[PDB]
Amino acid sequence: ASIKVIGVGGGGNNAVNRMIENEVQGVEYIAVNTDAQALNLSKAEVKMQIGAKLTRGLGAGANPEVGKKAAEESKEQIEEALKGADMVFVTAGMGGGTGTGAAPVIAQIAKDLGALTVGVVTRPFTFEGRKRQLQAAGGISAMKEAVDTLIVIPNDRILEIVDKNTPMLEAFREADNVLRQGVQGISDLIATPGLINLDFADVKTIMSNKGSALMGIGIATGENRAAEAAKKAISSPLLEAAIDGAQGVLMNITGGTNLSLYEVQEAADIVASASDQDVNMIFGSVINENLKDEIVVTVIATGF
Amino acid sequence: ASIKVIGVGGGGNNAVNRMIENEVQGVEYIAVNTDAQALNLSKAEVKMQIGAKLTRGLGAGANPEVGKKAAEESKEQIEEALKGADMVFVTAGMGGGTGTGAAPVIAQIAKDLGALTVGVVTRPFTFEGRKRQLQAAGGISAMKEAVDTLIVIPNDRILEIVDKNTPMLEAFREADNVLRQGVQGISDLIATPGLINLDFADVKTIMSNKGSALMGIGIATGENRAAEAAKKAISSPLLEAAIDGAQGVLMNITGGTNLSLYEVQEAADIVASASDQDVNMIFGSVINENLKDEIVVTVIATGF
């Protein structure tokens, strides 16, 4: 499949950088921004400055209507960058001017090109202030109408996972990495050979015109790791609701070379038992040799 | 010498990235910003978020007084990052909130630590608008009082050099690269073995408490290249004034392996003839093997 990951605005650009840094296979990267400096820091080969006439490379401020207009200014160039894609991941931090306003435009473009369009976006941390929070909710509504499936990750839940003395800059970097795992959790199953892959059509049945979706991540080491990562994924603080409310579930279990098929099934089993009995569930597994005795379960719940 | 290059705000962060990309030797990189996304895109090992309480990682807006206050919030951490430096290059695009306001604070910190403090900053392009232009001039005055030498590069002059159809995003990337060449033109002579190096004390005599400075860059290929690069450097559109107004001049001539000592002298000679008869002039040369038949002359004129 031709898969494109388009990172919109600061947060989205960082997610794309995290993916490049982690050598995610089988995807093309596009970095999009109204801020030319941010964009020139991007490791992506395709760097798309949007709303050059409107913003002059200076960014959108915090106004999402400016981000929207900048994307509208650059419709034709966004179209050209996305032509040929079978699947487009639109990734963004919601709350600011560019992500919140430009991401929904770009998602709708991807859709109008016939791509399976998956949004993977964050709600901002509470410490970013109340206006960012409200703007984000508006962007999330707008995104919902423009994508096939929209994964929303609340950044405040990251803080319930990480060390309480995690500095602000590292908290932001953790959110980039969650966005990365939301994209890569799906993509790797279609596009990276591992232990169990999925056909694009399986993923599509789960994501196509489904609306709201959630993500849980579970990490565990050593004995009982498969059961524990699974139980941790399905109870992840990242989950805004329980996965039994979902029409579809996708599970990715990623491990090192000691990951076994019976471990994958036992994770799958736990996830299936947690899901609706009439869920459509699919799952796969890939190997990352940097992992030793710890595995990672990522669960995407679609169609709430 | 312990040399630190501290890039402040978007433009400054990009300059530091350009240096890292070009494997500049013998310097430590610090990336500084109020915008946590930009900063997390930086390739520098030391990433310093300033004004975390004041700005929440959201940036300074376009208000330089916010950049100033953010730096003031983080004085202690800026001090800790700069301790031990013999020379500090503070690099920034002037015009916006963070560079314009934070850079002068950081320069004065470097000075109060005993560093030879060289500012290398740009005036913004006219297309960035009139307010950015005015703010920039204010920042440049503020910087002048805080550094030993302040190199100012007008971005609009880049446009007189590059192709008229150069896209906006690439114009910005060209300004980053000019800032890079202003830093690296000095640093390489002290810190990278080549054909003729300078002692730190020579450079210091030229830069210390000198105030305003200018830069010219000349590039030429093949026959007569040394004479031509030199004549092009001394007549560079980047120069806001003629170099004969300077108390000091530094020349760096960089070439591939066919660069000769007699070529270096003949460049030096041209630059000396263009300078005041009572200039203090110093010069050096280094080799970059990616250069074939083209050489690069960079001239820094100090003490106007």
Coordinates of C-alpha atoms in Angstrom, one line a residue:
Chain A
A1 CA 0.0 0.0 0.0
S2 CA 1.1 3.6 -0.5
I3 CA 1.1 5.0 3.0
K4 CA 1.8 8.7 3.7
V5 CA 2.2 10.2 7.2
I6 CA 1.5 13.9 7.1
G7 CA 2.5 15.8 10.3
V8 CA 0.7 19.1 10.6
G9 CA 2.0 21.9 12.8
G10 CA 4.6 21.7 15.6
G11 CA 3.4 18.6 17.4
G12 CA 2.8 16.7 14.1
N13 CA 6.2 17.6 12.8
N14 CA 7.7 16.2 16.0
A15 CA 5.8 13.0 15.6
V16 CA 7.1 12.6 12.1
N17 CA 10.6 13.3 13.4
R18 CA 10.2 10.6 16.1
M19 CA 9.2 8.1 13.4
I20 CA 12.2 9.0 11.2
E21 CA 14.4 8.6 14.3
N22 CA 12.9 5.2 15.0
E23 CA 13.3 4.1 11.4
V24 CA 9.7 3.2 10.8
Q25 CA 9.5 1.3 7.5
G26 CA 7.1 1.5 4.5
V27 CA 5.9 5.1 4.8
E28 CA 6.4 8.4 3.2
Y29 CA 6.8 11.5 5.4
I30 CA 5.4 15.0 4.7
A31 CA 6.0 17.8 7.2
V32 CA 3.5 20.7 7.1
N33 CA 3.6 24.0 8.8
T34 CA 2.9 27.7 8.5
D35 CA 6.1 28.3 10.6
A36 CA 9.1 28.1 8.2
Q37 CA 11.7 27.7 11.1
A38 CA 10.0 24.6 12.5
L39 CA 9.7 23.2 9.1
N40 CA 13.4 23.8 8.3
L41 CA 14.2 21.8 11.5
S42 CA 12.2 18.8 10.2
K43 CA 14.0 15.6 9.2
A44 CA 11.3 14.9 6.5
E45 CA 12.3 15.0 2.9
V46 CA 9.1 16.6 1.9
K47 CA 8.6 20.0 3.7
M48 CA 5.4 21.8 2.9
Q49 CA 5.1 25.4 3.9
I50 CA 1.4 26.2 3.8
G51 CA -0.2 29.7 3.7
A52 CA 3.0 31.4 2.6
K53 CA 1.0 34.5 1.3
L54 CA -1.2 34.6 4.4
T55 CA 1.4 33.9 7.1
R56 CA 4.8 34.7 5.4
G57 CA 6.4 31.7 7.1
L58 CA 5.7 33.3 10.4
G59 CA 3.3 30.7 11.8
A60 CA -0.5 30.9 12.4
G61 CA -0.5 32.4 15.9
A62 CA -2.9 30.4 18.1
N63 CA -5.8 31.0 15.8
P64 CA -7.1 27.9 14.1
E65 CA -9.0 29.9 11.5
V66 CA -5.6 31.1 10.2
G67 CA -4.4 27.5 10.0
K68 CA -7.5 26.6 8.1
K69 CA -7.1 29.5 5.7
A70 CA -3.4 28.6 5.2
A71 CA -4.3 25.0 4.2
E72 CA -7.0 26.4 1.9
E73 CA -4.4 28.7 0.3
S74 CA -2.2 25.6 -0.3
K75 CA -4.9 23.1 -1.3
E76 CA -3.4 22.4 -4.7
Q77 CA 0.1 21.7 -3.3
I78 CA -1.4 19.5 -0.5
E79 CA -3.2 17.6 -3.2
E80 CA 0.0 17.1 -5.2
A81 CA 1.9 15.9 -2.2
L82 CA -0.9 13.3 -1.3
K83 CA -1.7 11.9 -4.8
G84 CA -1.4 8.1 -5.1
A85 CA -1.8 7.3 -1.4
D86 CA -3.8 4.3 -0.3
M87 CA -3.7 5.4 3.3
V88 CA -3.0 8.8 4.8
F89 CA -2.2 9.3 8.5
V90 CA -2.8 13.0 9.5
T91 CA -1.0 13.6 12.8
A92 CA -1.2 16.8 14.9
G93 CA -1.2 18.2 18.4
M94 CA -4.6 19.9 18.8
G95 CA -4.9 23.2 20.5
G96 CA -2.8 25.7 18.5
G97 CA -3.3 27.6 15.2
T98 CA -1.8 25.2 12.6
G99 CA -2.6 21.7 13.8
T100 CA -6.2 22.6 14.9
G101 CA -7.1 24.5 11.8
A102 CA -5.0 22.9 9.0
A103 CA -5.3 19.2 10.0
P104 CA -9.0 18.9 9.2
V105 CA -8.6 20.5 5.8
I106 CA -5.7 18.2 4.9
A107 CA -7.8 15.2 6.2
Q108 CA -10.7 16.1 3.9
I109 CA -8.3 16.5 0.9
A110 CA -6.9 13.0 1.6
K111 CA -10.5 11.7 1.7
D112 CA -11.4 13.5 -1.5
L113 CA -8.4 11.7 -3.1
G114 CA -9.7 8.3 -2.1
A115 CA -7.3 7.6 0.7
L116 CA -8.2 5.7 3.9
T117 CA -7.7 8.7 6.2
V118 CA -6.7 8.2 9.8
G119 CA -6.3 11.1 12.1
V120 CA -4.0 10.6 15.1
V121 CA -4.1 13.7 17.3
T122 CA -3.5 14.8 20.9
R123 CA -5.5 16.8 23.4
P124 CA -3.1 19.3 25.0
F125 CA -1.8 19.2 28.6
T126 CA -3.8 21.2 31.1
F127 CA -0.7 23.3 31.8
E128 CA -0.9 24.7 28.3
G129 CA -4.0 26.6 29.5
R130 CA -7.7 26.6 29.0
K131 CA -8.0 28.2 25.6
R132 CA -5.7 25.7 24.0
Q133 CA -7.9 23.0 25.6
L134 CA -11.1 24.5 24.1
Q135 CA -9.6 25.1 20.7
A136 CA -8.5 21.5 20.7
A137 CA -12.0 20.2 21.2
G138 CA -13.2 22.3 18.3
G139 CA -10.4 20.9 16.1
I140 CA -11.3 17.4 17.2
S141 CA -14.9 17.9 16.1
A142 CA -13.8 19.3 12.8
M143 CA -11.3 16.4 12.3
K144 CA -14.0 13.8 13.1
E145 CA -16.0 14.9 10.0
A146 CA -13.0 14.7 7.7
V147 CA -11.4 11.4 8.5
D148 CA -12.3 7.7 8.3
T149 CA -11.1 7.1 11.9
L150 CA -9.8 9.7 14.5
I151 CA -7.6 8.4 17.3
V152 CA -7.5 11.0 20.2
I153 CA -4.9 10.8 22.9
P154 CA -5.2 12.9 26.0
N155 CA -1.7 14.3 26.9
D156 CA -2.7 14.7 30.5
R157 CA -2.9 11.0 30.8
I158 CA 0.8 10.8 29.9
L159 CA 1.5 12.6 33.1
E160 CA -0.1 9.7 35.0
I161 CA 2.4 7.4 33.5
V162 CA 5.7 9.3 33.5
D163 CA 7.9 10.3 36.5
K164 CA 6.3 13.2 38.4
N165 CA 9.6 15.2 38.0
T166 CA 9.6 14.8 34.2
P167 CA 10.6 18.2 32.8
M168 CA 8.1 20.1 30.6
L169 CA 10.2 19.6 27.5
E170 CA 10.4 15.9 28.0
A171 CA 6.7 15.6 28.6
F172 CA 6.1 17.2 25.2
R173 CA 8.6 14.8 23.7
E174 CA 6.6 11.9 25.3
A175 CA 3.5 13.1 23.6
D176 CA 5.3 13.1 20.2
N177 CA 6.2 9.5 21.0
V178 CA 2.7 8.5 21.8
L179 CA 1.5 9.9 18.4
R180 CA 4.4 8.0 16.8
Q181 CA 3.1 4.8 18.5
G182 CA -0.4 5.4 17.3
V183 CA 0.7 5.7 13.7
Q184 CA 3.3 3.0 13.8
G185 CA 1.2 0.6 15.7
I186 CA -1.1 0.4 12.7
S187 CA 1.4 0.9 9.9
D188 CA 4.0 -1.6 11.0
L189 CA 1.3 -4.4 10.7
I190 CA 0.6 -3.6 7.1
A191 CA 4.1 -2.6 6.0
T192 CA 6.8 -4.2 8.1
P193 CA 7.4 -7.9 7.9
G194 CA 7.2 -9.5 11.3
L195 CA 5.5 -12.5 12.9
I196 CA 1.9 -11.8 11.8
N197 CA 1.0 -9.1 9.3
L198 CA -2.4 -7.8 8.2
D199 CA -3.6 -7.1 4.7
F200 CA -4.5 -3.5 4.0
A201 CA -8.1 -4.7 3.4
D202 CA -8.3 -6.0 7.0
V203 CA -7.2 -2.7 8.4
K204 CA -9.5 -0.8 6.1
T205 CA -12.6 -2.8 7.3
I206 CA -11.8 -1.6 10.8
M207 CA -11.0 2.0 10.1
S208 CA -13.2 3.0 7.1
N209 CA -15.9 5.5 8.0
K210 CA -15.8 4.5 11.7
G211 CA -15.3 7.9 13.4
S212 CA -14.0 8.0 17.0
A213 CA -11.2 5.8 18.2
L214 CA -9.0 5.2 21.2
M215 CA -5.6 3.9 22.0
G216 CA -4.0 2.0 24.9
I217 CA -0.4 1.0 25.3
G218 CA 0.9 -1.7 27.7
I219 CA 4.5 -2.5 28.3
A220 CA 5.7 -5.4 30.5
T221 CA 8.9 -7.4 31.1
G222 CA 9.9 -11.1 31.7
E223 CA 7.4 -13.6 33.1
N224 CA 3.8 -13.2 32.3
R225 CA 4.7 -10.2 30.1
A226 CA 2.2 -11.1 27.4
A227 CA -0.7 -11.3 29.8
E228 CA 0.5 -8.2 31.7
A229 CA 1.2 -5.9 28.6
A230 CA -2.2 -6.9 27.4
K231 CA -4.0 -6.2 30.6
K232 CA -2.1 -2.9 30.9
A233 CA -3.0 -1.9 27.2
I234 CA -6.7 -2.5 27.9
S235 CA -6.6 -0.5 31.1
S236 CA -4.2 2.2 29.8
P237 CA -4.7 5.7 31.2
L238 CA -4.5 6.8 27.5
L239 CA -7.9 5.2 27.0
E240 CA -10.8 7.7 27.2
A241 CA -13.3 4.8 27.4
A242 CA -13.3 1.0 27.7
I243 CA -12.7 -1.0 24.5
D244 CA -15.9 -3.0 24.9
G245 CA -17.7 0.0 23.4
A246 CA -15.8 -0.5 20.1
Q247 CA -17.1 -2.1 16.8
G248 CA -13.5 -2.8 15.9
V249 CA -10.2 -3.5 17.6
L250 CA -6.7 -3.7 16.3
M251 CA -3.9 -5.1 18.4
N252 CA -0.1 -4.9 17.7
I253 CA 2.2 -6.8 19.9
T254 CA 5.9 -5.9 19.4
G255 CA 8.8 -7.7 21.0
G256 CA 12.4 -8.7 20.5
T257 CA 13.4 -12.1 19.1
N258 CA 12.1 -14.1 22.1
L259 CA 8.5 -13.0 21.4
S260 CA 6.4 -16.2 20.7
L261 CA 3.3 -17.0 18.8
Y262 CA 1.7 -18.4 21.9
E263 CA 2.5 -15.0 23.6
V264 CA 0.8 -13.2 20.8
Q265 CA -2.3 -15.4 21.0
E266 CA -2.5 -15.0 24.7
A267 CA -2.4 -11.2 24.4
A268 CA -5.0 -11.4 21.6
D269 CA -7.2 -13.5 23.8
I270 CA -7.0 -11.1 26.7
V271 CA -7.8 -8.2 24.3
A272 CA -10.7 -10.2 22.8
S273 CA -12.2 -11.0 26.2
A274 CA -12.1 -7.3 27.1
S275 CA -13.8 -6.3 23.8
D276 CA -17.5 -6.6 22.7
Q277 CA -18.4 -10.2 21.8
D278 CA -19.4 -8.8 18.4
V279 CA -16.2 -6.7 17.9
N280 CA -14.4 -7.2 14.6
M281 CA -10.8 -7.7 16.0
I282 CA -7.6 -8.1 14.1
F283 CA -4.1 -8.3 15.4
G284 CA -0.5 -8.7 14.3
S285 CA 3.0 -8.7 15.7
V286 CA 6.4 -7.4 14.6
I287 CA 10.0 -7.7 16.0
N288 CA 12.2 -4.9 17.2
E289 CA 15.5 -6.3 18.3
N290 CA 16.3 -3.3 20.6
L291 CA 13.6 -4.9 22.8
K292 CA 15.1 -7.6 25.1
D293 CA 12.6 -9.1 27.7
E294 CA 10.0 -6.3 27.4
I295 CA 7.2 -6.3 24.8
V296 CA 4.8 -3.6 23.8
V297 CA 1.1 -4.0 23.2
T298 CA -0.8 -1.3 21.4
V299 CA -4.5 -1.5 21.2
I300 CA -6.6 0.7 18.8
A301 CA -10.4 0.6 19.4
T302 CA -12.5 1.8 16.5
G303 CA -16.1 2.7 15.9
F304 CA -17.4 4.0 19.3
Chain B
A1 CA 39.4 27.2 23.6
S2 CA 36.0 26.2 24.9
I3 CA 33.6 27.5 22.3
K4 CA 29.9 27.4 22.7
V5 CA 27.4 28.3 20.0
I6 CA 24.0 29.1 21.5
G7 CA 21.1 29.4 19.0
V8 CA 18.2 31.5 20.3
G9 CA 14.7 31.1 18.9
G10 CA 13.6 29.6 15.6
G11 CA 16.3 31.1 13.3
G12 CA 19.1 30.5 15.8
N13 CA 18.0 26.9 16.3
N14 CA 18.1 26.4 12.5
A15 CA 21.7 27.9 12.3
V16 CA 22.8 25.4 14.9
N17 CA 21.1 22.6 12.9
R18 CA 23.0 23.8 9.7
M19 CA 26.2 23.7 11.7
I20 CA 25.6 20.1 13.0
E21 CA 24.6 19.0 9.4
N22 CA 27.9 20.5 8.1
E23 CA 29.9 18.8 10.9
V24 CA 31.5 22.0 12.2
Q25 CA 34.3 20.9 14.5
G26 CA 35.5 22.1 17.9
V27 CA 32.2 23.7 19.3
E28 CA 29.4 22.8 21.7
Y29 CA 25.8 23.5 20.6
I30 CA 23.0 24.8 22.8
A31 CA 19.5 25.2 21.3
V32 CA 17.3 27.7 23.2
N33 CA 13.7 28.5 22.7
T34 CA 10.3 29.3 24.4
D35 CA 8.7 27.0 21.8
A36 CA 9.0 23.4 23.0
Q37 CA 8.1 21.9 19.5
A38 CA 10.8 23.8 17.7
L39 CA 13.2 22.8 20.4
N40 CA 12.3 19.1 20.2
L41 CA 13.1 19.2 16.5
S42 CA 16.6 20.5 17.2
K43 CA 19.6 18.2 16.5
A44 CA 21.6 19.8 19.4
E45 CA 22.3 17.6 22.4
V46 CA 21.7 20.5 24.8
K47 CA 18.1 21.7 24.4
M48 CA 17.2 24.6 26.7
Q49 CA 13.6 25.5 27.1
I50 CA 13.4 29.1 28.5
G51 CA 10.4 30.7 30.3
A52 CA 8.6 27.5 31.0
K53 CA 6.5 29.1 33.7
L54 CA 5.8 32.3 31.6
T55 CA 5.2 30.7 28.2
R56 CA 4.4 27.0 29.0
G57 CA 6.4 25.8 26.0
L58 CA 4.1 27.7 23.7
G59 CA 6.5 30.3 22.4
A60 CA 6.8 34.0 23.0
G61 CA 4.4 35.3 20.4
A62 CA 6.1 38.1 18.5
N63 CA 6.6 40.2 21.6
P64 CA 10.4 40.6 22.4
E65 CA 9.5 41.6 26.0
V66 CA 8.2 38.1 26.5
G67 CA 11.4 36.6 25.1
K68 CA 13.4 38.9 27.5
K69 CA 11.3 37.8 30.5
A70 CA 11.6 34.1 29.5
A71 CA 15.4 34.4 29.5
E72 CA 15.3 36.3 32.8
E73 CA 13.1 33.5 34.2
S74 CA 15.9 31.0 33.1
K75 CA 19.0 33.0 34.0
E76 CA 20.4 30.3 36.3
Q77 CA 20.0 27.6 33.8
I78 CA 21.5 29.7 31.0
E79 CA 24.4 30.4 33.3
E80 CA 24.9 26.7 34.0
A81 CA 24.8 25.8 30.3
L82 CA 27.5 28.5 29.5
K83 CA 30.0 28.0 32.4
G84 CA 33.5 27.4 31.2
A85 CA 33.2 28.9 27.8
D86 CA 36.2 31.0 26.5
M87 CA 34.1 32.1 23.5
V88 CA 30.3 32.2 23.1
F89 CA 28.5 32.8 19.8
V90 CA 25.0 33.9 20.3
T91 CA 23.1 33.4 17.0
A92 CA 19.5 34.5 16.3
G93 CA 17.1 35.8 13.6
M94 CA 16.0 39.2 14.8
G95 CA 12.4 40.3 14.5
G96 CA 10.4 37.8 16.4
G97 CA 9.6 37.4 20.2
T98 CA 12.3 35.0 21.3
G99 CA 15.4 35.8 19.3
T100 CA 14.9 39.6 19.6
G101 CA 14.2 39.6 23.4
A102 CA 16.1 36.6 24.7
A103 CA 19.4 36.9 22.7
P104 CA 20.6 40.1 24.4
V105 CA 20.0 38.6 27.9
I106 CA 21.9 35.5 27.0
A107 CA 24.7 37.6 25.4
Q108 CA 25.0 39.7 28.6
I109 CA 25.1 36.4 30.7
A110 CA 28.0 35.1 28.5
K111 CA 29.8 38.4 29.1
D112 CA 29.2 38.3 32.8
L113 CA 30.8 34.8 32.8
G114 CA 33.9 36.2 31.1
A115 CA 33.3 34.8 27.6
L116 CA 34.3 36.6 24.5
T117 CA 30.8 37.1 23.2
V118 CA 30.1 37.3 19.6
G119 CA 26.6 37.9 18.3
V120 CA 25.7 36.7 14.8
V121 CA 22.2 37.9 13.9
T122 CA 20.0 38.6 10.9
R123 CA 17.7 41.4 9.9
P124 CA 14.5 39.9 8.6
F125 CA 13.3 39.8 5.0
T126 CA 11.0 42.7 4.0
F127 CA 8.3 40.2 3.1
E128 CA 8.1 39.3 6.8
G129 CA 6.5 42.7 7.3
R130 CA 7.3 46.1 8.8
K131 CA 6.8 45.3 12.5
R132 CA 9.3 42.4 12.4
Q133 CA 11.7 44.9 10.7
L134 CA 11.3 47.5 13.5
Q135 CA 11.5 45.0 16.3
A136 CA 14.6 43.6 14.8
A137 CA 16.3 47.0 14.9
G138 CA 15.4 47.3 18.6
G139 CA 16.9 43.9 19.2
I140 CA 20.0 44.8 17.3
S141 CA 20.5 47.9 19.5
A142 CA 19.9 45.9 22.7
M143 CA 22.4 43.1 21.4
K144 CA 25.1 45.7 20.6
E145 CA 25.3 46.7 24.3
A146 CA 25.6 43.0 25.4
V147 CA 28.2 41.5 23.1
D148 CA 31.9 42.1 22.3
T149 CA 31.2 42.1 18.5
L150 CA 27.8 42.0 16.8
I151 CA 27.7 40.7 13.2
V152 CA 24.5 41.8 11.4
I153 CA 23.4 40.2 8.2
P154 CA 20.5 41.7 6.2
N155 CA 18.4 38.9 4.9
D156 CA 17.1 41.0 2.0
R157 CA 20.6 41.0 0.5
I158 CA 20.4 37.2 0.3
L159 CA 17.6 37.8 -2.3
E160 CA 20.0 39.7 -4.5
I161 CA 22.2 36.7 -4.6
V162 CA 19.8 33.7 -5.0
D163 CA 17.6 32.8 -7.9
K164 CA 14.6 35.1 -8.2
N165 CA 12.3 32.0 -8.1
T166 CA 13.8 30.7 -4.9
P167 CA 10.8 29.5 -2.8
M168 CA 10.1 31.2 0.6
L169 CA 11.1 28.2 2.6
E170 CA 14.5 27.9 0.8
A171 CA 15.1 31.6 1.3
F172 CA 14.8 31.1 5.0
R173 CA 17.1 28.1 4.8
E174 CA 19.6 30.3 3.0
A175 CA 19.5 32.8 5.9
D176 CA 20.2 29.9 8.4
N177 CA 23.2 29.1 6.2
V178 CA 24.6 32.6 6.2
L179 CA 24.4 32.7 10.0
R180 CA 26.2 29.3 9.9
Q181 CA 29.0 30.8 7.8
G182 CA 29.4 33.8 10.0
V183 CA 29.9 31.5 13.1
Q184 CA 32.0 28.9 11.2
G185 CA 34.1 31.4 9.4
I186 CA 35.6 32.5 12.7
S187 CA 35.4 29.2 14.7
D188 CA 37.0 27.0 12.1
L189 CA 40.2 29.2 12.1
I190 CA 40.6 28.7 15.9
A191 CA 39.3 25.2 16.2
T192 CA 39.8 23.2 13.0
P193 CA 43.2 22.3 11.7
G194 CA 43.8 23.6 8.2
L195 CA 46.5 25.5 6.3
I196 CA 46.7 28.6 8.5
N197 CA 45.0 28.8 11.9
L198 CA 44.8 31.6 14.3
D199 CA 45.4 31.6 18.0
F200 CA 42.4 32.5 20.2
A201 CA 44.3 35.6 21.3
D202 CA 44.5 36.9 17.7
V203 CA 40.7 36.6 17.3
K204 CA 40.1 38.1 20.6
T205 CA 42.1 41.2 19.9
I206 CA 39.8 41.8 16.8
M207 CA 36.5 41.0 18.5
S208 CA 36.8 42.2 22.1
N209 CA 34.7 45.2 23.0
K210 CA 34.5 46.3 19.3
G211 CA 30.7 46.7 18.7
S212 CA 29.4 46.6 15.2
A213 CA 30.6 44.3 12.5
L214 CA 29.8 43.1 9.0
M215 CA 30.3 40.1 6.9
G216 CA 31.0 39.5 3.1
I217 CA 31.1 36.1 1.4
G218 CA 32.7 35.5 -2.0
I219 CA 32.7 32.2 -4.0
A220 CA 34.6 31.7 -7.2
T221 CA 35.7 28.7 -9.3
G222 CA 38.8 27.8 -11.4
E223 CA 41.1 30.3 -12.8
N224 CA 41.6 33.5 -10.9
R225 CA 39.4 32.1 -8.1
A226 CA 41.4 33.5 -5.3
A227 CA 41.4 37.1 -6.7
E228 CA 37.7 36.8 -7.6
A229 CA 36.3 35.2 -4.4
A230 CA 38.2 38.0 -2.5
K231 CA 36.9 40.8 -4.7
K232 CA 33.4 39.3 -4.4
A233 CA 33.7 39.0 -0.5
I234 CA 34.8 42.7 -0.2
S235 CA 31.9 43.8 -2.5
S236 CA 29.3 41.3 -1.1
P237 CA 25.7 42.5 -1.0
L238 CA 25.8 41.1 2.6
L239 CA 28.0 44.1 3.6
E240 CA 26.1 47.0 5.0
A241 CA 29.2 49.2 4.6
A242 CA 32.7 49.0 3.0
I243 CA 35.3 47.2 5.1
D244 CA 37.8 50.2 5.0
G245 CA 35.6 51.6 7.8
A246 CA 36.8 48.7 10.1
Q247 CA 39.4 48.7 12.9
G248 CA 39.8 45.0 12.4
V249 CA 39.3 42.4 9.6
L250 CA 39.3 38.7 9.7
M251 CA 39.5 36.6 6.5
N252 CA 38.8 32.9 6.2
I253 CA 39.5 31.3 2.8
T254 CA 38.2 27.8 2.6
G255 CA 38.9 25.4 -0.4
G256 CA 39.4 21.8 -1.3
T257 CA 42.8 20.2 -1.5
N258 CA 44.0 22.3 -4.5
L259 CA 43.9 25.5 -2.4
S260 CA 47.4 26.9 -2.2
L261 CA 49.3 29.2 0.1
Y262 CA 50.0 31.6 -2.7
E263 CA 46.2 31.7 -3.3
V264 CA 45.6 32.4 0.4
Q265 CA 48.1 35.3 0.3
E266 CA 46.7 36.8 -2.8
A267 CA 43.2 36.8 -1.3
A268 CA 44.6 38.3 1.9
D269 CA 46.4 40.9 -0.1
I270 CA 43.2 42.0 -1.9
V271 CA 41.3 42.1 1.4
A272 CA 44.2 44.2 3.0
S273 CA 44.2 46.6 0.0
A274 CA 40.4 47.1 0.5
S275 CA 40.7 47.7 4.2
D276 CA 42.0 50.8 6.2
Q277 CA 45.8 51.0 6.1
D278 CA 45.7 51.0 9.9
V279 CA 43.3 48.0 10.1
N280 CA 44.4 45.1 12.3
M281 CA 43.9 42.2 9.9
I282 CA 44.2 38.5 10.5
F283 CA 43.4 35.6 8.3
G284 CA 43.5 31.8 8.0
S285 CA 42.4 29.0 5.7
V286 CA 41.0 25.5 6.2
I287 CA 40.2 22.6 3.8
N288 CA 36.8 21.1 3.0
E289 CA 37.2 18.3 0.6
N290 CA 33.6 18.6 -0.7
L291 CA 34.9 21.7 -2.5
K292 CA 36.5 20.9 -5.9
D293 CA 37.6 24.0 -7.9
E294 CA 35.5 26.5 -6.0
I295 CA 36.7 28.3 -2.9
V296 CA 34.9 30.4 -0.3
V297 CA 36.2 33.7 1.1
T298 CA 34.5 35.0 4.2
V299 CA 35.4 38.4 5.5
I300 CA 34.4 39.7 9.0
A301 CA 35.0 43.5 9.5
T302 CA 35.1 44.6 13.1
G303 CA 35.1 47.9 15.0
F304 CA 33.1 50.3 12.8

